[PDB]
Design a protein around this ligand. Structure first.
Ligand SMILES: Nc1ncnc2c1ncn2[C@@H]1O[C@@H]2COP(=O)(O)O[C@H]2[C@H]1O
Lengths: 506, 506, 506, 506
């Protein structure tokens, strides 16, 4: 029913509307703002405005292609099918002029949309209306009717008047730059791709119009004996032969190849050729510019990784490091970053709490399932530890811990193997999902066995200040870490007295 | 009166003068520095200096266009209108040489302006004066007068001497690069735009001069039978026909199209053509360079947003995240930044206190009007809270708070809806302008109800260390937050005893 | 034995496999995942897959070169050696189609490899299979056999059908982009180098195919009197003469030089020429793009140093600094960075503990050998100091210390000379490997002698908060620093009483 | 005497030597390392090595220009002046081969210079020696002597052999890339400038050699009737006519203009032309690349300021700020940075203590002279305050202080005027060199008068934590600030009792 048509002129509820205004409670307020204004106003983001702009764009490219050819290569632009086509394609561009008095303008000053008739009618007439009117009315047929109540000059002047219809190109530029931002906001296609597909449309269009101009000036001069058409003896050839040749001549100038058969011979030809050369050669330089901007946007991640790693060689060479040590540094960069560039501490800081909580669970589900102390704890404790772990990598043969130092960290093994070493201990191994380094952080003493990486291993580490911050909020968990610690100190025979005293009569 | 003319040579009070010197008390000191020097000195930023440079620029472009044509395509450069024009356009360029002995030089060493006659007269004569003198005096008419007390060689040598007037191009370059910096400091037009509009002027000028040189060498050789003018049989054609052809030949070399009618046939033509090809092809490569520099400056913001967001996909793929979780991360980036790139904590830190105080009020006038605790407080308290809020966004279904955790934050709802959930509570809702999370920060206990986002919502958050820092300076406000808190704990039935005890007999 | 062949289809243990999966325990798990699937599956990183792709690439470039020539410049493509060659080079491209039903696809969604037959057969047939089948079967000989049970049109149509074999270019693009990533991950060649060597292959190939197309259309039209072959009178010349000319014509369009002998004369030639001009001129613009991307990647370090140092002149000119002070600042930047750009505090922070411990030893072995207090200490103390030193540089004549200030630092001399100055002290010198500034940090008092650089010297410095943090963990070392300090205070005669009292009866 | 010649082969003491090694004590050690080696060794940075490389470069460019012409355009390369010139220019390039067995190689591995004869003789013969020998000996005259004990083929083969002398270009490339780094380290000319002046040398040289090749192949074929020389009828013209034409043809291909008179007619010409087109068009694309790299390095500072300020408009538009507030923000950025981009807190942190102390005095000599409390203090106190000041700017009408707030800062007026306002106070003014805000920091109370900017003013500010840190080290200075404070509180009548009590009986 007609109420579904009355709903087509107000703003919609597609994801663009939500991105521009926020929640549905902002969209439904702006939707009433329209309905409570004057008798009809079209919202610039309405489905009606958007389908109208597509109907215009599809028809307007057709008109900017056909009109130059129908003016240039034909006599009798007052015959039946041309009178029908130019009348029909005048009405739609005149309805478009009417609807621009009743469309709400977006403001570059970032306000709410102007959305009122007395503001819109004043804002439009002070801008594009002078070009929009001249390009809409049939000035050539109006002039022909006024002059209707020797004669060959009238056919030349009405040809020159009819070319005012090319000013539609202003609407093609205005409607693309608005319609493009809606698609570019919603569908995320890259800047240089969109800019190139606009510029390829302009190159072909300027080239097509030049390929008409190069024949139109000879025609308005009545084919003088010195011009290219008369020297090539092609005044009476079919229109497709003449057009194919004039377009070849026009794009030969643009791509800088030559000028067709021979160099210009007359004054008109000389000055049309130079204008075409300048417009062509300055337009192809803008294409080389956009091609360069495209190519440099595509390798961004690879380039930034190379530009980062080249800076490490500046440091290694300034300190004059040995060639085997350079290899350990180069190899570590492959195992820690896998050729990808990012800054984890910068990205994780822009996300809110509940995304950061979800990502930091997914990286660690192997520990949470495999390791016994997390597997039965309250989930508000497990998320209090996993949010404070930091990620580290060790190469085979490196010591993570040495005996007789102090403090700072403990480690959980995400992947790989680490060995535990002490006097008279023989040897011992820790696999994936286990943890080490807790004794120094509980007892406040020195370290009691060395630990060494047996394969390329991924560890998560927890610092002494963060470890106490978690356990002070959950004192039931400290007893679990202590009742594991006292058992490990029994196997190694170290039997430390302060922890054994700290457990008694709990 | 004449004192208004004597005031024209000293520095003005337009916004450039204030930007260079600071307050009016610096400008009025420099204005006396001029007046207290020698009998007359012109300040380089004076309105007289600036209108004199415009009179020169407008006339100097006219001379560098007309002089090559009047030398090349004409005999009789001693006829009445040429004697009048070259005399008149000699006097202004000789007055310009006089005023450069009395203009204060700007120093590249960033000092005060040199502004003294014995320093200026020594600094000028050691630099451009040798080129400025040769380009100002009528050397060709002086030579013609000296030789005045078979003959065809004198007309050739006086043509070659008269081309010394093209050295004016040094003044055109010097005066543009100074005059441009005043406009570029005051009106803020972008680097590549200004640099392109300078280079387009040089391309057309070099092309025009080459289009004269290509005919001048044939003329000084008296049109030998092998040269392009004699082979094309155009020795006696009108000057406009000859010039249009010679310019077409010159720009055909620059844009690399061909060489006109046919390839060179003589020694002079061969070496003029190659010089023109090298100057042309190296000059068009600089245009492609500036076109590339322009295009890459225009998409800066879009590009940097793409280059930022591409780096998040490096992180999500390194951690091998699931495809539905990638969608939550992608969607959050659209709701928090709306496709715009900036760093709020870096920009706000460069502004002074009273700008930062004004911006942080404008973002929050909705809270300050709608919420009851700010609406009657002292404005020095309200500005003490709003300056410490941080901005956060939550997606629908995410928990902001869970029961049985601890501390850190409280939240004010700028836009959207949040629901409050607890055992036997049924359900409850908070709308725009309200606040939650205060109970944990006042009581120092654990949380007492969960809170969950019901629509895409914008929150401002306040941390526990900043919350106590404000309330310690305004103890009257803590009573308001507590007398709301005790009422909310009654509705949920939790009735916490420490806060109820803390209120008694105040 | 055949088990070594059955081992060729599973993943290997070369450094790429370790980089993709981690330790050998991840590789050996994926290696069983393959063996435990269906009867045969080829892993995409297998040595069999990689040698098969090389056999295809080497043969496929040969086919995309020979096929256009054998179709264009020859009659009798049913003669003995062509029947042998096209049959043989059909079988290998049909075995390749069979093995793509049994190769595990890599997933762009970063999962484990799909590695199952029912998933692979469904994923392939929904994508490239339609082009892979058409390019593999001998459609021209199949059509010739079907039609085998006036005639000149069949030879033209079988020429047009046989060009379906050029769709192999899709396999050449697919196989390069996978095979390249393995080499680019393992051997680290830069982005723009690899991208240029791909594009040079496409330029020569498009140019070769265009050089066939430019003759093929005349041949399919039976050499009409208006076309370039008939006007140049070369219908009966040897095939090498015709091909050399048609390739010259094709690359003349691509590099924008001309069009061979003369401009086109017929409708076919005009539209083939314009298509060749557009494909050529848009392809050469992509080469200028990649050449620009290469050149800007090579000077990265030099450029960034210039772009950094230019920013210091913005600061020195904003503060209007004197010209001799600018020279001290310029000279300091040469002695501290030696023209190399890096950020030491950012690089050292990405490395793990045991690399950072090794680099910070290598920079200081001169101190550890030459200076007496480190040379006999426990290595866990020496590594506790060297990990907290910071690096500084001083110009000759600058004071490092003044008498009568307080605290902050002490210094170790890596290289150069410093002099010690005090009232009635005469003069005194410290050489490489010595240290100064300890008295203020031990006694908590003020400084007691000035110190001044006598040559461009490199110092390591230690801050007062870090100095106490080390000595609190190793109280035996504080006695060494104190028993040196009390001896130095005796030579200068200052004899400070608090330190002398602090030593008694230890 | 000869000892001054023996000193020419060891390293010097010019600023490059100091930049590479550090102090003179490193240079004088390396200088002995040379003298204590084998009988003679040339150090690569010696004045002898550097003048020898200049003698080679100047002569080698002369040989790579003359040799192609003397081979191509002349018969009788065994005549008197050619035998003299080729013998002489063989000896110097053979002495150069001898001295490369006795020059110390720089190592790309950043070690000390290899500087020993058994290492150098092994390292050279495994690299460039094969090309250095072939390019040094007169192979053509050796072959002519061996063949010396119908004949026209010997003159063709000795022409082809004599072109081996062009391999000298390897020495021209090797010697430039070493000699350039010494100048580029010492004199600081920008990357793209140096790279362009190298590439312009290669363009002219390749173009010159191509202009010889284009005539040499016709000559070795004995001028066949189809080639360009015979069609242009110029077999007997003077050598300058032939060379000028062949160079025009060669650079017409490089700059893509045409191919001279007409398109190629024979097989040799066709394949020489295409090789010249490919070498030319790929070499001009590298010039457009370097021209783009030059132009983008020159506007670096202007561009970065625009790219910074464009990011502020992203922030102002995301918050939808009013248009008058945007103007205050835009205007503040002009008064605080004056269109220059830097980060003061990053630059000042890279300088050592005694530079940072000197710069921070020069910015403040106006305060230190004009203000009474600094003007008589100990210089170790004045440098303890000035090193902790921060710089701020305020627009006219903004409040710096409001009554009834608390703490944080005090201010010193570098330039401009500020007014002091209170109830019943009338009005009061502070000029340049005075200070305000001390009462709140001494008394720990609230503020007691408002302060407002009366002109665009520059302030230095000091924070409460830094203020107490200075005064605790210099308790005599706190009495000065207090004895000013108590006098100011008397003028305003506030008469605060805690400070008045704190002064009694000192
Ligand atoms: N026998 C053991 N079995 C397993 N782990 C042990 C054993 N003995 C010691 N450890 C661990 O080795 C760690 C070495 O560093 P810490 O002494 O701080 O803590 C030690 C324990 O976590």
């Amino acid at each position: 029913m007609q109420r579904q048509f009355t709903s087509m002129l107000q703003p919609g509820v597609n994801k663009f509307s939500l991105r521009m205004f926020g929640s549905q409670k902002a969209v439904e307020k702006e939707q009433e703002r329209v309905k409570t204004a004057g008798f009809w106003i079209i919202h610039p983001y309405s489905d009606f405005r958007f389908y109208w702009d597509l109907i215009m764009l599809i028809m307007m490219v057709g008109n900017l292609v056909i009109i130059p050819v129908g003016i240039t290569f034909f006599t009798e632009q007052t015959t039946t099918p041309w009178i029908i086509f130019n009348v029909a394609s005048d009405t739609v561009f005149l309805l478009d002029l009417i609807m621009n008095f009743r469309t709400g303008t977006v403001n570059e000053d970032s306000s709410e949309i102007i959305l009122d008739p007395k503001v819109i009618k004043m804002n439009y007439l002070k801008s594009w209306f002078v070009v929009d009117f001249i390009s809409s009315i049939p000035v050539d047929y109006i002039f022909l009717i006024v002059e209707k109540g020797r004669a060959l000059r009238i056919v030349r002047f009405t040809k020159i008047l009819s070319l005012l219809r090319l000013l539609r190109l202003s609407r093609l530029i205005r409607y693309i730059h608005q319609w493009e931002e809606i698609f570019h906001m919603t569908y995320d296609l890259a800047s240089a791709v969109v800019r190139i597909f606009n510029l390829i449309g302009m190159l072909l269009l300027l080239c097509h119009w030049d390929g008409c101009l190069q024949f139109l000036v000879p025609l308005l001069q009545d084919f003088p004996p010195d011009c290219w058409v008369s020297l090539n003896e092609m005044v009476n050839d079919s229109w497709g032969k003449q057009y194919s040749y004039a377009l070849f001549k026009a794009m030969s100038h643009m791509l800088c190849i030559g000028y067709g058969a021979q160099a210009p011979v007359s004054m008109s030809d000389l000055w049309i050729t130079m204008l075409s050369m300048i417009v062509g050669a300055t337009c192809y330089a803008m294409f080389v510019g956009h091609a360069t901007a495209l190519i440099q946007s595509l390798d961004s991640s690879r380039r930034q990784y190379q530009e980062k790693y080249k800076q490490v060689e500046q440091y290694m060479s300034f300190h004059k490091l040995p060639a085997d040590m350079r290899q350990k540094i180069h190899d570590y960069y492959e195992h820690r970053y896998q050729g990808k560039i990012f800054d984890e501490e910068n990205i994780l800081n822009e996300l809110n709490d509940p995304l950061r909580e979800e990502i930091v669970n997914f990286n660690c589900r192997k520990l949470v399932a495999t390791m016994p102390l997390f597997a039965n704890a309250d989930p508000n404790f497990v998320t209090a530890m996993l949010s404070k772990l930091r990620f580290e990598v060790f190469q085979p043969g490196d010591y993570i811990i040495r005996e007789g130092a102090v403090g700072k960290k403990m480690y959980f093994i995400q992947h790989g193997v680490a060995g535990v070493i002490t006097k008279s201990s023989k040897e011992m191994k820790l696999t994936d999902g286990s943890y080490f380094g807790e004794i120094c952080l509980l007892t406040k003493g020195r370290r009691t066995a060395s630990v060494r990486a047996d394969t390329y291993c991924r560890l998560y580490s927890l610092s002494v200040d963060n470890f106490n911050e978690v356990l002070e909020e959950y004192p039931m968990m400290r007893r679990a870490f202590e009742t594991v610690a006292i058992d490990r100190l029994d196997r190694i025979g170290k039997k430390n007295s302060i922890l054994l005293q700290k457990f008694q009569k709990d």
